[PDB]
Write a protein that binds this ligand. Structure first.
Ligand code: B12
Ligand code: B12
Ligand code: SF4
Ligand code: SF4
Ligand SMILES: [Ca+2]
Ligand SMILES: [Ca+2]
Lengths: 262, 323, 441, 262, 441
């Protein structure tokens, strides 16, 4: 399980304040704090507040790698901010994200191949988020074709089956689990999968409990990565424990410590 | 070939809620009314016991209501007197309950004082012997004061009081708990809010079987399917063992059906819609009839003829269809 | 997509290993995994191949009433609750008329039945057929009625006569429009089925209860006719509701092939008001075709409204076109209103500016069929989005004024809208019903 | 998720004593503690020490149903003790257990249909515990077929794929998960499933963490019941949460408490 | 089954809906799920038949060497690591024989080869075949060599000659024994394949490298012979291990049908000791059949031990039959030793007590085939289960004395043993190797 730290996001106050007044201090400590928690990848999102996307992302990519060699997950809908971010990326990179639309596939797929970065692919059209798993699979199959087409290695494509809040969209959670399960029957080697984990508990009671429980369930269905709270120790314990129960990692009494310090 | 009937046995049943209280119980009602106890889908006698029939409460207000003439005509002699209005509903129109809607309390309307509202309640209680349902005008501040005073004055009568809502339930719940009344929990077409509201109410120590669910129904032609499916889900939840969805269901069909243009628009303006009188009667009756199929236990109605044809429908539905 | 148990309980149970599998149980589980073909077993009955193929087929058969543009699909359903997915094919409504009636009484009723179509809230409702019942003493009166009925209407037809010889003589001139034949009975099914088969007509099957129904179906299916509609013999609402539920349940949940057919229901209430309620119950509890006797516009409208309601897709909202809708008169001095795409919202705002005779414009924004609050919350109603509409509509050309009224439940947005656009934004009433009051003010 | 309380087991110290000296207090108190925790069934195991299993099982059934109306899960390898227990059961019960040995099948399947009791079926014969999910699955077909054969309702059969400790049998855990999710192919309606949950963490570090993580994973793969520690609050919360994320129960903010007081 | 991607690129690109599916990419989904069949689509190459087999069939075919009781099964493996599941079919071993040998040298050597079977720790090892090699100049020497070998053994045969007419001659007398024909090459494959088909014999196919191998296999299977064993032409250890790994991986992980067959390996080392080590590499790395030249008992025994070890089921421990077994000719004064029924455990006590030439009885307490310290830490070794079997063994009648020797690692079970047993338990060495010194004293 690859935990992608979610904290360096412009939707947060101190990250908004730091990007606005160009202060590397809060961005860099969050890069360190998440790494200490167990994250081996860091999500970078300039946010809805800041407006200079192209120049904001470049600054996040630069100040972060001054104190971190973790894989940077560039999170923006603006491609000019994404491509400009891959430029100043000395570390390994991940693109977040593309969807199942051709005007997005033609742009983001070869860009990922050219820079050799990993590519997150949302299983949705322009119309919006699918209702069931069968529709999610259709888009996931289309994302697979684009990987084989544009020459992107299958283990660098992260299929995202789009998890929704369990309070207003409860019927989506099992559909996502079914989607995760059935993704292995799209390609061989099967594409990897990822979730925006925190989305499952948006506006719910006991968000950490819901988050870590769904992580375990999703991993049991084949989840490989998760954008999540890397500073949630109970969530990290779950990821460590689930790897053991999937026989992905050899057991030892200090299994939690080993994941955290991997 | 040979047919084996498919029976789905239930884990649990919807609660039994008792309305009203006789003299020996501390009230003045002539009898009580029980709703709920269903251990199957609506009227599926062949796979579970349906012990209590659904009942109808006819609406009475503390004012001459802003209703169409068609709706007022069956009450023209008594419509200005809640007591005599209630008597006519019971004695002539077969009402099981009186639904006393205190619209007169509206601070932007008649603004009837607290004392005037409890006098109206006392007037109706002295006029008929059937159990009462009492709900306010919809103004949050005013209804707090009125329903508190009503719960105090009619203590012993075991009323059904409404409406508790997600952001507004504590005061009414407390009044119901301390003075021994039942409560209506009204949620905005949302089964999650419905469920949590029942929990919040219960957590104040009002017992589960003193709560009834109002899912905020839509009228025929104006979103009724949405409330229909929520009510089927509520019933399904009840049968599967979800305690917080096992409350009996109440439906404001009188209000919702009669705000529809189709209910009262003249045939002279809408020739294709047919005569207005039986159209309006059927508009309310069809709303009730469909909702009965989704598991309604208490129907709040207005037109006496809609009431009569619905009671007959209920009568036919209560005939056992066991094999 | 086939249970290993289902596949197994249909195999010879020899364990001969001819299929390249130690036992049948291991081969059935192998089949569910999709390893070897079912043809790998040389034995097993022909019924095994039949039930296996049927298991992959839809539980309820689609059967068409009538032919041409008038034809209507019945059955073809998969759900017990619409919230699990949806219901697909709206109930077919047939108004009954008797052959005991005089010719002038017959024509007067047929003409009335033909007038049972409705327009409401941007929707159009129709009924689907006329049922001719044989009540007269002489068989010629039935042929007289059907010929009279067929000559007066283009609706679908359903012919109700127990005697096959009476039915065939009345069928001949009207067989080209595929009428439903009512009904096959344990007394006449051999003759009736031949009639249905030789004419390619849909055949109604009558049984006195579920057991009789299932057996008669099996015989008629064995005779080679599979366009069937089911009549369990239920003539009271409680018994009907139970029987229709069983037919629907057994077909869907148990794959009972005898009941894999749509249902016909007959109302029996003598009171027309009671009849409508009885019909409302039948469209709710899985009837595919219902036969009424009342033909009043007052009675059919609420029934057809409920039918439309129940069969709406719970997944997709009913939506109107995102194009300025002119109400009433068109002065060009007219106040232009703003609201969403949702049809329920749109005719609540229009039916509020039409019932109060306020000639004005109704600007229907494209919110993907969503309601005001649902569009906003989904980031589907934002001032910038509104501004594009205020120009994309091109309305500015029509009005001599640039004021825009805004949903009262979205009061905050307007100031953010007023500036960006350049129009004057007034925040109207929370509910649309307050439009009659805000205009005069 | 039906939690079946594991605590009234003879292999426990305080329980072994109680059966030897017919002390009802330890049995009845555990019965109440487990129900308060959220158990809706009680496992009753005579133990290795006791000689007369019949006289012991009867006493266990007798003193338990005095203070509890929960379903009694009669747990013993002694079949004669099982039927001797069913003769005293006022409330509904289940049998624990039978394997796929034909000798055991016709000895317990009618005995389950007889008293109207659920039946747990272990996916093994005398050979031992299969490793591959396909072999576990093969024994499950036999259990399923032997249910329709003897007329036991499919939702009264509880297939147990036998979970093993994560230290010495780590590679069994993902096999158990694969077996659970492929049970959907055996019948429709699919049979129910159960695990001896605590067995997954035997002799491991942080057993509670391992137990609850595997519970969530197993439920995502279709687990219906678990013999487990009903006095483990974190385990009960996990059960509650996983039900929500599978849309098996309508969400509410108080989802944890509602499971507990169900 | 199969991956949805690989049926898609195999599917054309018409997007013509004739299959019943909108586009080709979705018909890929419907196939991988089990909705429709490939028979629906009119447009597809012969890859449709390939999809039928490559998906359903096991990754590695099972081909048989020989007929009747001596028949051995090759291939039919699913794993790359024994610990993931297990390896199923022990490596077949063949000793090479040359037709240059005189008629007397030939029979002496076959006699020696016939003696190449071994008994060790409860196990019996045997070799599977004799390989006859055509080295002589004149072709008649091969038929004579094959005739004399076949008359002197019932082991399976592999016939090695490049000229098909040479094989045809020898095949006349031993075809019913179903020998392996070695081998089809690019220069003789048509004649060789015709020979294999006519005689129903497994055929070895040779390629110089993986590429030639794969091409030749495809030609042979197209001629209708699928009983094949593969030789990628590797004659050096490092190349062989990589080539065998590729063949095993491509078949199992990629369903590459050209390599879906068992492997034949030929040792090349001139030193018999080097040849043995080369052979253990080959049995470790996926060879289904290896041909040796050395025929000494000293060399075969270690090789055959490793084969048995490697191919042991990792999930099920080999067990000895519980009962007590007499070491030598045991009298009524000889000792008695307690152990478990784990074959390894048991025989480390049998082999030690025998080496000291100590006549004594050994009772094996079934611990489900678990080690002394394994079962004792599981509970299946308690003082009880040792006591109960103390009578169940019937050893009471064998010895005058009643003293029990217990493993030193189980010394803690002494006091509890004596009270129940009525015997005088004694603590032996924690390791059997010291029983000699413990018996003396
Ligand atoms: C049915 C429904 C849905 C259906 C969709 C129906 C649709 N086609 O819009 C579905 C289930 C898909 C849905 C989804 C959501 N919903 Co919703 N939904 C409802 C529900 C129960 C009914 C809405 C409705 O049909 N109302 C009736 C029509 C007529 O309403 P109306 O457009 O507002 O118009 C009236 C007035 O505004 C006014 N008016 C309209 N136009 C004009 C114009 C002028 C000039 C004037 C003066 C007045 C005026 O007059 C009209 C008549 O009285 C409501 C609210 C409730 N219980 O009352 C919640 C509600 C709107 N939903 C809500 C929400 C948040 C959502 C979601 C965002 C939930 C989520 N997943 O996060 C999703 C949307 C995103 C998505 N789809 O993923 C909230 C919104 C309020 C809020 N933000 O807090 C509500 C109120 C529920 C709640 N939270 O209590 N929803
Ligand atoms: C293979 C193995 C297993 C295999 C099973 C093999 C089997 N069939 O018994 C498996 C993985 C299943 C296993 C399981 C466990 N194992 Co383990 N296992 C081993 C391992 C690596 C090898 C055992 C073996 O095969 N030994 C070889 C044979 C020949 O040993 P042997 O029977 O003792 O007999 C020799 C001597 O005792 C003596 N002897 C024997 N009989 C007699 C008789 C007489 C008269 C005399 C004089 C001498 C004598 O001579 C013999 C030859 O030298 C060992 C230890 C190691 N690395 O040395 C651990 C070991 C035995 N296992 C151990 C344990 C604890 C377990 C478990 C209980 C762990 C757990 N999961 O909780 C489980 C058992 C329960 C269960 N199954 O759930 C411990 C036991 C010691 C201890 N208690 O601390 C060990 C030592 C590991 C450790 N902790 O360091 N195990
Ligand atoms: S060939 Fe048919 S009867 Fe024989 S074992 Fe296979 S499935 Fe059973
Ligand atoms: S029939 Fe064949 S070519 Fe045509 S759309 Fe279907 S899969 Fe593609
Ligand atoms: Ca995966
Ligand atoms: Ca399940």
């Amino acid at each position: 399980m690859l935990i992608i730290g979610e904290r360096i996001n412009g939707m947060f106050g101190d990250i908004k304040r730091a990007i606005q007044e160009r202060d590397p201090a809060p961005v860099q400590e969050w890069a360190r704090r998440q790494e200490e928690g167990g994250a081996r990848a860091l999500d970078l999102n300039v946010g809805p507040a800041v407006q200079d996307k192209v120049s904001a992302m470049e600054w996040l990519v630069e100040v972060t790698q001054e104190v971190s060699n973790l894989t940077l997950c560039l999170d923006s809908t603006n491609i000019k901010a994404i491509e400009a971010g891959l430029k100043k990326c000395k570390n390994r990179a991940m693109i977040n994200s593309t969807n199942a639309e051709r005007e997005k596939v033609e742009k983001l797929f070869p860009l990922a191949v050219e820079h050799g970065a990993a590519l997150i692919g949302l299983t949705m059209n322009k119309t919006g988020i699918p209702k069931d798993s069968d529709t999610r699979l259709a888009f996931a199959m289309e994302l697979v074709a684009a990987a084989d087409e544009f020459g992107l290695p299958m283990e660098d494509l992260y299929i995202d089956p789009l998890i929704l809040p369990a309070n207003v969209a409860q019927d989506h959670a099992p559909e996502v689990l079914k989607t995760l399960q059935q993704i292995k029957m799209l390609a061989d080697p099967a594409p990897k999968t990822v979730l925006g984990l925190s989305n499952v508990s948006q506006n719910c009671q006991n968000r950490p409990l819901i988050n870590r429980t769904f992580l375990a369930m999703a991993m049991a269905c084949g989840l490989d990565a998760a954008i999540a709270d890397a500073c949630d120790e109970a969530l990290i314990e779950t990821a460590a424990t689930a790897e053991i129960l999937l026989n992905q990692t050899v057991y030892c009494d200090s299994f939690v410590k080993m994941f955290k310090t991997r | 070939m040979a047919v084996q009937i498919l029976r789905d046995r239930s884990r649990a049943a919807v609660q039994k809620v008792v309305l009203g209280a006789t003299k020996d119980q501390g009230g003045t009602r002539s009898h009580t009314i029980v709703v709920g106890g269903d251990a199957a889908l609506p009227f599926h006698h062949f796979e579970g016991e349906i012990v209590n029939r659904p009942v109808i409460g006819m609406e009475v207000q503390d004012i001459v209501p802003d209703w169409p003439d068609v709706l007022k005509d069956p009450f023209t002699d008594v419509i200005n007197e809640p007591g005599r209005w209630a008597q006519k509903c019971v004695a002539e129109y077969g009402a099981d309950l009186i639904y006393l809607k205190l619209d007169g309390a509206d601070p932007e309307g008649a603004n009837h004082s607290v004392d005037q509202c409890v006098a109206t309640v006392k007037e109706v209680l002295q006029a008929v012997g059937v159990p009462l349902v009492v709900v306010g005008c919809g103004d949050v501040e005013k209804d707090h004061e009125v329903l508190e005073a009503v719960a105090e004055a009619a203590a012993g009568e075991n009323l059904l009081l409404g409406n508790a809502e997600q952001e507004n339930y504590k005061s009414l719940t407390a009044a119901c708990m301390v003075h021994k009344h039942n409560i209506i929990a009204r949620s905005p077409l949302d089964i999650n809010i419905c469920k949590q509201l029942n929990i919040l109410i219960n957590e104040m120590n009002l017992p589960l079987d003193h709560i009834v669910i109002d899912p905020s129904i839509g009228g025929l032609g104006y979103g009724i399917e949405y409330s229909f499916s929520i009510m089927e889900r509520i019933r399904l939840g009840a049968l599967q063992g979800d305690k917080m969805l096992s409350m009996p269901v109440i439906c404001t069909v009188g209000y919702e059906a009669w705000r529809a243009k189709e209910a009262s628009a003249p045939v002279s303006e809408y020739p294709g819609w047919g005569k207005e009188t039986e159209r309006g009667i059927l508009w309310e009756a069809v709303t009730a009839t469909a909702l009965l199929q989704a598991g309604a236990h208490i129907l709040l109605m207005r037109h006496p003829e809609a009431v009569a044809r619905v009671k007959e429908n209920i009568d036919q539905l209560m005939v056992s269809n066991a094999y | 997509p086939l249970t290993g148990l289902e596949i197994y309980k249909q195999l010879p149970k020899k364990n001969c290993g001819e299929c390249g599998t130690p036992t049948c149980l291991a081969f059935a589980m192998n089949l569910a995994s999709g390893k070897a073909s079912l043809d790998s077993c040389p034995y097993v009955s022909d019924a095994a191949r039949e039930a296996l193929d049927a298991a992959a087929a839809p539980p309820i058969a689609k059967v068409v009433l009538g032919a041409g543009p008038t034809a209507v699909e019945m059955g073809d359903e998969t759900e017990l609750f619409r919230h699990d997915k949806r219901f697909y094919h709206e109930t077919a409504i047939a108004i009954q008329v008797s052959d005991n009636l005089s010719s002038e009484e017959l024509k007067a009723k047929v003409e009335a039945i033909n007038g049972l179509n409705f327009d409401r809230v941007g929707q159009h409702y129709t009924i689907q057929a006329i049922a001719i019942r044989h009540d007269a003493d002489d068989p010629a009166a039935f042929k007289a009625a059907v010929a009279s009925v067929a000559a007066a209407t283009q609706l679908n037809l359903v012919l109700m006569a127990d005697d096959p010889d009476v039915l065939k003589e009345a069928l001949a001139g009207v067989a080209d429009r595929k009428p439903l034949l009512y009904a096959a009975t344990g007394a006449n099914y051999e003759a009736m089925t031949a009639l249905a088969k030789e004419n390619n007509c849909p055949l109604a099957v009558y049984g006195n209860g579920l057991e009789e129904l299932a057996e008669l179906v099996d015989k008629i299916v064995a005779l080679g006719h599979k366009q069937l509609v089911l009549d369990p013999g239920a003539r009271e609402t409680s018994r009907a509701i139970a029987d229709f539920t069983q037919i629907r349940r057994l077909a869907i949940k148990k794959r009972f092939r005898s009941f894999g057919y749509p249902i016909i229901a007959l109302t029996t209430a003598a009171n027309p008001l009671d009849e409508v309620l009885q019909a409302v119950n039948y469209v709710t509890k899985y009837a595919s075709l219902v036969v009424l006797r009342t033909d009043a516009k007052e009675h059919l409208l609420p029934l057809l409204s409920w039918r439309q309601n129940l069969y709406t897709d719970p997944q997709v909202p009913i939506r109107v076109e995102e194009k300025l809708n002119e109400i009433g008169a068109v002065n060009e001095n007219s106040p232009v209103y703003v609201t969403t795409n949702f049809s329920l919202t749109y005719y609540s705002v229009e039916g509020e500016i039409e019932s109060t005779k306020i000639p004005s414009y109704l600007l229907s924004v494209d919110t993907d069929g969503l309601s005001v609050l649902t569009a906003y919350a989904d980031g589907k109603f934002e001032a910038e989005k509104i501004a594009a509409v205020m120009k994309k509509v091109d309305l500015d050309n029509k009005v001599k004024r640039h004021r825009i009224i805004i949903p009262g439940a979205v009061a905050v947005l307007k100031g953010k809208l007023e500036d960006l656009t350049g129009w004057e934004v007034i925040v109207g009433p929370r509910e649309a019903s307050g439009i009659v009051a805000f205009a005069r003010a």
